[PDB]
PDB file of C-alpha atoms in Angstrom:
ATOM      1  CA  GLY A   1      72.055  80.702  99.153  1.00  0.00           C
ATOM      2  CA  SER A   2      75.917  80.819 100.231  1.00  0.00           C
ATOM      3  CA  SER A   3      77.152  79.735 103.623  1.00  0.00           C
ATOM      4  CA  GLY A   4      80.393  80.375 105.436  1.00  0.00           C
ATOM      5  CA  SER A   5      83.318  79.008 106.094  1.00  0.00           C
ATOM      6  CA  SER A   6      86.365  79.930 107.918  1.00  0.00           C
ATOM      7  CA  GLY A   7      89.041  78.010 109.747  1.00  0.00           C
ATOM      8  CA  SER A   8      93.175  77.335 108.674  1.00  0.00           C
ATOM      9  CA  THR A   9      94.546  76.617 111.673  1.00  0.00           C
ATOM     10  CA  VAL A  10      98.648  76.847 111.398  1.00  0.00           C
ATOM     11  CA  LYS A  11      99.785  74.750 114.441  1.00  0.00           C
ATOM     12  CA  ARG A  12     103.579  75.650 113.438  1.00  0.00           C
ATOM     13  CA  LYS A  13     105.903  73.821 115.790  1.00  0.00           C
ATOM     14  CA  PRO A  14     108.497  70.749 115.754  1.00  0.00           C
ATOM     15  CA  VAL A  15     108.026  67.411 117.058  1.00  0.00           C
ATOM     16  CA  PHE A  16     109.216  69.055 120.361  1.00  0.00           C
ATOM     17  CA  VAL A  17     108.363  71.884 122.039  1.00  0.00           C
ATOM     18  CA  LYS A  18     110.765  74.755 123.258  1.00  0.00           C
ATOM     19  CA  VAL A  19     111.250  76.184 127.045  1.00  0.00           C
ATOM     20  CA  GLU A  20     109.695  79.326 125.768  1.00  0.00           C
ATOM     21  CA  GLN A  21     107.254  78.465 124.521  1.00  0.00           C
ATOM     22  CA  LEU A  22     105.917  77.046 127.536  1.00  0.00           C
ATOM     23  CA  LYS A  23     103.223  78.443 129.421  1.00  0.00           C
ATOM     24  CA  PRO A  24     100.205  78.697 132.246  1.00  0.00           C
ATOM     25  CA  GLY A  25      97.922  75.399 132.040  1.00  0.00           C
ATOM     26  CA  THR A  26      99.795  73.625 130.034  1.00  0.00           C
ATOM     27  CA  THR A  27     100.661  69.861 130.574  1.00  0.00           C
ATOM     28  CA  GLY A  28     102.020  67.505 129.217  1.00  0.00           C
ATOM     29  CA  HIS A  29     105.208  68.088 127.155  1.00  0.00           C
ATOM     30  CA  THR A  30     107.964  66.840 124.925  1.00  0.00           C
ATOM     31  CA  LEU A  31     111.303  68.607 124.616  1.00  0.00           C
ATOM     32  CA  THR A  32     114.757  68.401 125.044  1.00  0.00           C
ATOM     33  CA  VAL A  33     116.364  70.120 128.069  1.00  0.00           C
ATOM     34  CA  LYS A  34     119.572  70.610 128.752  1.00  0.00           C
ATOM     35  CA  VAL A  35     121.047  70.618 132.601  1.00  0.00           C
ATOM     36  CA  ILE A  36     123.322  73.563 133.577  1.00  0.00           C
ATOM     37  CA  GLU A  37     123.529  73.697 137.614  1.00  0.00           C
ATOM     38  CA  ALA A  38     122.043  71.377 139.995  1.00  0.00           C
ATOM     39  CA  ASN A  39     122.177  72.346 144.212  1.00  0.00           C
ATOM     40  CA  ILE A  40     119.640  72.067 146.489  1.00  0.00           C
ATOM     41  CA  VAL A  41     116.832  74.496 146.917  1.00  0.00           C
ATOM     42  CA  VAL A  42     118.234  76.765 149.204  1.00  0.00           C
ATOM     43  CA  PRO A  43     115.152  78.772 151.753  1.00  0.00           C
ATOM     44  CA  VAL A  44     114.388  82.061 151.068  1.00  0.00           C
ATOM     45  CA  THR A  45     114.122  82.704 147.654  1.00  0.00           C
ATOM     46  CA  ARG A  46     112.134  79.871 146.149  1.00  0.00           C
ATOM     47  CA  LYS A  47     111.060  76.778 149.203  1.00  0.00           C
ATOM     48  CA  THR A  48     107.299  75.069 148.633  1.00  0.00           C
ATOM     49  CA  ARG A  49     106.939  71.134 148.781  1.00  0.00           C
ATOM     50  CA  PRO A  50     106.623  70.861 152.850  1.00  0.00           C
ATOM     51  CA  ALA A  51     104.069  73.734 153.620  1.00  0.00           C
ATOM     52  CA  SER A  52     103.389  72.171 157.092  1.00  0.00           C
ATOM     53  CA  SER A  53     104.356  69.285 157.645  1.00  0.00           C
ATOM     54  CA  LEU A  54     106.963  67.516 160.101  1.00  0.00           C
ATOM     55  CA  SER A  55     106.983  64.912 162.917  1.00  0.00           C
ATOM     56  CA  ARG A  56     106.148  61.848 160.890  1.00  0.00           C
ATOM     57  CA  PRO A  57     109.567  59.550 159.173  1.00  0.00           C
ATOM     58  CA  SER A  58     109.363  60.112 156.207  1.00  0.00           C
ATOM     59  CA  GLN A  59     111.446  58.321 153.491  1.00  0.00           C
ATOM     60  CA  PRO A  60     114.950  60.462 152.048  1.00  0.00           C
ATOM     61  CA  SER A  61     113.328  62.378 149.297  1.00  0.00           C
ATOM     62  CA  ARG A  62     116.674  63.617 147.859  1.00  0.00           C
ATOM     63  CA  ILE A  63     115.048  66.487 146.070  1.00  0.00           C
ATOM     64  CA  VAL A  64     117.567  69.299 144.055  1.00  0.00           C
ATOM     65  CA  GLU A  65     116.943  71.939 141.577  1.00  0.00           C
ATOM     66  CA  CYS A  66     118.848  71.701 139.229  1.00  0.00           C
ATOM     67  CA  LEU A  67     118.903  74.625 135.126  1.00  0.00           C
ATOM     68  CA  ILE A  68     117.293  72.611 132.924  1.00  0.00           C
ATOM     69  CA  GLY A  69     116.379  74.160 129.534  1.00  0.00           C
ATOM     70  CA  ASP A  70     116.973  75.062 125.955  1.00  0.00           C
ATOM     71  CA  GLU A  71     118.361  77.476 123.620  1.00  0.00           C
ATOM     72  CA  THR A  72     115.624  79.682 124.058  1.00  0.00           C
ATOM     73  CA  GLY A  73     115.302  79.637 127.595  1.00  0.00           C
ATOM     74  CA  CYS A  74     115.231  77.656 131.144  1.00  0.00           C
ATOM     75  CA  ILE A  75     113.375  76.804 134.095  1.00  0.00           C
ATOM     76  CA  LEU A  76     112.935  75.808 137.491  1.00  0.00           C
ATOM     77  CA  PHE A  77     112.275  71.557 137.231  1.00  0.00           C
ATOM     78  CA  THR A  78     112.867  69.640 140.634  1.00  0.00           C
ATOM     79  CA  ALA A  79     114.399  65.913 140.029  1.00  0.00           C
ATOM     80  CA  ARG A  80     113.742  63.136 142.783  1.00  0.00           C
ATOM     81  CA  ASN A  81     116.571  61.554 144.217  1.00  0.00           C
ATOM     82  CA  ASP A  82     115.791  59.523 141.347  1.00  0.00           C
ATOM     83  CA  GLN A  83     114.932  61.949 138.846  1.00  0.00           C
ATOM     84  CA  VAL A  84     118.251  64.419 140.124  1.00  0.00           C
ATOM     85  CA  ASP A  85     121.007  61.869 138.861  1.00  0.00           C
ATOM     86  CA  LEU A  86     118.834  62.299 135.379  1.00  0.00           C
ATOM     87  CA  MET A  87     118.714  65.940 136.172  1.00  0.00           C
ATOM     88  CA  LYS A  88     122.493  66.251 136.570  1.00  0.00           C
ATOM     89  CA  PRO A  89     124.590  68.796 135.612  1.00  0.00           C
ATOM     90  CA  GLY A  90     126.181  69.156 132.295  1.00  0.00           C
ATOM     91  CA  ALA A  91     123.632  66.349 130.963  1.00  0.00           C
ATOM     92  CA  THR A  92     120.860  66.467 128.197  1.00  0.00           C
ATOM     93  CA  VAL A  93     117.750  64.769 129.416  1.00  0.00           C
ATOM     94  CA  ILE A  94     113.876  65.176 128.023  1.00  0.00           C
ATOM     95  CA  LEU A  95     111.114  65.879 129.586  1.00  0.00           C
ATOM     96  CA  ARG A  96     107.809  63.491 128.366  1.00  0.00           C
ATOM     97  CA  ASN A  97     104.686  64.174 129.534  1.00  0.00           C
ATOM     98  CA  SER A  98     105.959  66.915 131.646  1.00  0.00           C
ATOM     99  CA  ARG A  99     103.531  69.605 132.971  1.00  0.00           C
ATOM    100  CA  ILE A 100     103.957  72.990 134.135  1.00  0.00           C
ATOM    101  CA  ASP A 101     102.821  74.071 137.734  1.00  0.00           C
ATOM    102  CA  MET A 102     101.689  77.482 138.144  1.00  0.00           C
ATOM    103  CA  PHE A 103     103.983  78.824 140.831  1.00  0.00           C
ATOM    104  CA  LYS A 104     103.128  82.010 142.330  1.00  0.00           C
ATOM    105  CA  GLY A 105     102.636  84.359 139.222  1.00  0.00           C
ATOM    106  CA  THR A 106     105.553  82.420 137.916  1.00  0.00           C
ATOM    107  CA  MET A 107     105.457  78.249 136.703  1.00  0.00           C
ATOM    108  CA  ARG A 108     108.480  75.725 136.337  1.00  0.00           C
ATOM    109  CA  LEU A 109     109.237  72.522 134.846  1.00  0.00           C
ATOM    110  CA  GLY A 110     108.231  69.111 135.762  1.00  0.00           C
ATOM    111  CA  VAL A 111     106.740  65.301 134.768  1.00  0.00           C
ATOM    112  CA  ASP A 112     103.673  63.913 136.660  1.00  0.00           C
ATOM    113  CA  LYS A 113     102.968  60.501 137.746  1.00  0.00           C
ATOM    114  CA  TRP A 114     101.861  59.948 133.841  1.00  0.00           C
ATOM    115  CA  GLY A 115     105.482  60.796 132.924  1.00  0.00           C
ATOM    116  CA  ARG A 116     108.872  59.168 132.978  1.00  0.00           C
ATOM    117  CA  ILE A 117     112.865  61.613 131.615  1.00  0.00           C
ATOM    118  CA  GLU A 118     114.083  60.078 128.738  1.00  0.00           C
ATOM    119  CA  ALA A 119     118.108  61.026 128.758  1.00  0.00           C
ATOM    120  CA  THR A 120     118.664  61.886 125.661  1.00  0.00           C
ATOM    121  CA  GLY A 121     122.213  61.693 124.360  1.00  0.00           C
ATOM    122  CA  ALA A 122     123.880  64.445 124.351  1.00  0.00           C
ATOM    123  CA  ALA A 123     121.898  68.442 123.812  1.00  0.00           C
ATOM    124  CA  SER A 124     123.979  69.753 121.281  1.00  0.00           C
ATOM    125  CA  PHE A 125     123.010  73.046 121.428  1.00  0.00           C
ATOM    126  CA  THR A 126     124.333  76.615 124.248  1.00  0.00           C
ATOM    127  CA  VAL A 127     121.069  76.609 126.670  1.00  0.00           C
ATOM    128  CA  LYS A 128     120.207  80.793 127.174  1.00  0.00           C
ATOM    129  CA  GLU A 129     120.860  80.316 130.864  1.00  0.00           C
ATOM    130  CA  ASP A 130     119.010  84.155 130.677  1.00  0.00           C
ATOM    131  CA  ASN A 131     115.768  83.646 128.907  1.00  0.00           C
ATOM    132  CA  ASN A 132     114.535  81.750 132.472  1.00  0.00           C
ATOM    133  CA  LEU A 133     110.851  81.038 132.650  1.00  0.00           C
ATOM    134  CA  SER A 134     111.628  80.454 136.743  1.00  0.00           C
ATOM    135  CA  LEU A 135     112.006  84.010 136.786  1.00  0.00           C
ATOM    136  CA  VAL A 136     109.612  86.008 134.436  1.00  0.00           C
ATOM    137  CA  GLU A 137     106.679  86.883 136.216  1.00  0.00           C
ATOM    138  CA  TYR A 138     102.685  86.011 134.303  1.00  0.00           C
ATOM    139  CA  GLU A 139     100.144  88.739 134.654  1.00  0.00           C
ATOM    140  CA  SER A 140     100.793  91.402 137.248  1.00  0.00           C
ATOM    141  CA  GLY A 141      99.638  90.110 140.538  1.00  0.00           C
ATOM    142  CA  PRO A 142     101.335  89.463 144.100  1.00  0.00           C
ATOM    143  CA  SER A 143     104.625  88.130 145.232  1.00  0.00           C
ATOM    144  CA  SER A 144     104.238  87.564 148.713  1.00  0.00           C
ATOM    145  CA  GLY A 145     101.339  88.737 151.077  1.00  0.00           C
TER     146      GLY A 145
END
């Protein structure tokens, strides 16, 4: 007699995800990120893309880092010469099928080839330019060396 069975599963979440709801090892996300600032990717702090590669004439992929997120938190997301437009400062856009890149003891918001920007109307929410996720570090590890 008897069998025994358990299971509940209570995701508990809206139709869209949140910034503070992001995590490493995750992909394809759907949330509304509001751009705050948009400035070129300065050296020293945060610098990755070329990784030893300078000689052949490539295309001008104007890349600029813009601060986007929601009331929850914010994260660093790279926007191409095209996305940049959508990722303009003071503009509200959404990320569909967005993936998270596991950065050196950190992470960031990005969109894969199987993902495109939405360009929602307006945010309507006050971004929390404090609970940055592109700053906090996950799992105590190295930094540079």
